[PDB]
A paper describes a structure:
Superoxide dismutase-1 (SOD1) is one of the most abundant human proteins and is an important part of our antioxidant, redox signalling and respiratory control mechanisms. SOD1 folding, zinc and copper acquisition, and disulphide bond formation can be catalysed by the copper chaperone for SOD1 (CCS), which forms a transient heterodimeric complex with SOD1 to facilitate its maturation. Here, we discover the mechanisms that govern SOD1 maturation and stabilisation through interaction with the chaperone protein hCCS. Combinations of mutants yielded crystallographic structures of full-length hCCS in two different conformers complexed with hSOD1; an hCCS domain II truncation complexed with hSOD1; an hCCS domain II homodimer structure at higher resolution than previously available (1.55 Å); and the hSOD1 disulphide knock-out mutant used to promote complexation.
Here, we describe several structures of the hSOD1 activating complex crystallised by inhibiting complex dissociation and aggregation through discerning mutagenesis of cysteines involved in normal and aberrant disulphide bond formation. We recently predicted hSOD1 disulphide sub-loop (amino acids His48–His63) movement on complexation with hCCS based on small-angle x-ray scattering (SAXS) data. This is proven true by our new structures, where it adopts a conformation that could not be accommodated if the hSOD1 disulphide were present. In illustration of this point, a recent nuclear magnetic resonance (NMR) characterisation indicated SOD1 amino acids 49–54 are disordered in the zinc-metalated, disulphide-reduced state.
Author numbering:
A (entry chain A), B (entry chain F): 1 to 153
The structure:
């Protein structure tokens, strides 16, 4: 099994640890962990193209998109590889993350290791927002916390 | 061609940005950038196995060593892949890093993307210390700052 980990940090109180595990190279990736300091409700959750945190989360560039698709939700055929949708924060501001995804990988062409995981200000509209920015970012607002996805033991 | 970048941070004053560039896959990786907050003199400079920053630099594991060799200097045949030797801080505590290495890579089995770059408390003895620890770590002392090596534009 391949394993990866991401420590999410930013300028505010938002912080968390996200784990990735992929049992076989042609099988799904399990993604799980916890993020605290968030407002109650939905928050965009994306893999961005670059593992560059030199100017914070901004230098991570756009959503990881090697097939040159439009933005969508994780269940959509039309999506970026990095489109993992929304995480939900409870009343205390904790988002317990538990996702399975078959588009991202921890090896080969859709490998997300060395790229940036980002958690956003507000809801990802999943490409249904009806403006240009819906097709690109999902209108999920500023980047609250980010980290480079690294190889784990 | 392929580029990577690493933001070095720790609990102390050591901070820096290190760039990686490899123009061809069968070819040397240029490593450069500035690290500040160091004590004047030599500091061990290594790629460690895991891109796991959950417990700081400590969770990064040992030197990246896919060929199960003993620790050495960058010029040695007997070395870990991650053995980049020393960097030198000047009298103002700044290490203007400029290294070229043909053993690390930004692709294939010796790929360092998604692993951790670490700068150490003191000099790497390059495996010439005459104790067991010299052939494991180079007696470079504590891990002062670390970062996950991410894919850059
Ligand atoms: Zn997207
Ligand atoms: Zn070593």
């Amino acid at each position: 099994a391949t394993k990866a980990v991401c420590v999410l940090k930013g300028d505010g109180p938002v912080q968390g640890i996200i784990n990735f595990e992929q049992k076989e190279s042609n099988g799904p990736v399990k993604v799980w962990g916890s993020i605290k300091g968030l407002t109650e409700g939905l928050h965009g959750f994306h893999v961005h193209e670059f593992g560059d945190n030199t100017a914070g989360a901004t230098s991570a560039g756009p959503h990881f998109n090697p097939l040159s698709r439009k933005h969508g939700g994780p269940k959509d055929e039309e999506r970026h590889v990095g489109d993992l949708g929304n995480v939900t924060a409870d009343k205390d501001g904790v988002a317990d993350v538990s996702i399975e995804d078959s588009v991202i990988s921890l090896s080969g062409d859709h490998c997300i290791i060395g790229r940036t995981l980002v958690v956003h200000e507000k809801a990802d509209d999943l490409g249904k927002g009806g403006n240009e920015e819906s097709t690109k970012t999902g209108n999920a607002g500023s980047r609250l916390a980010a980290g480079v996805i690294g190889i784990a033991q």
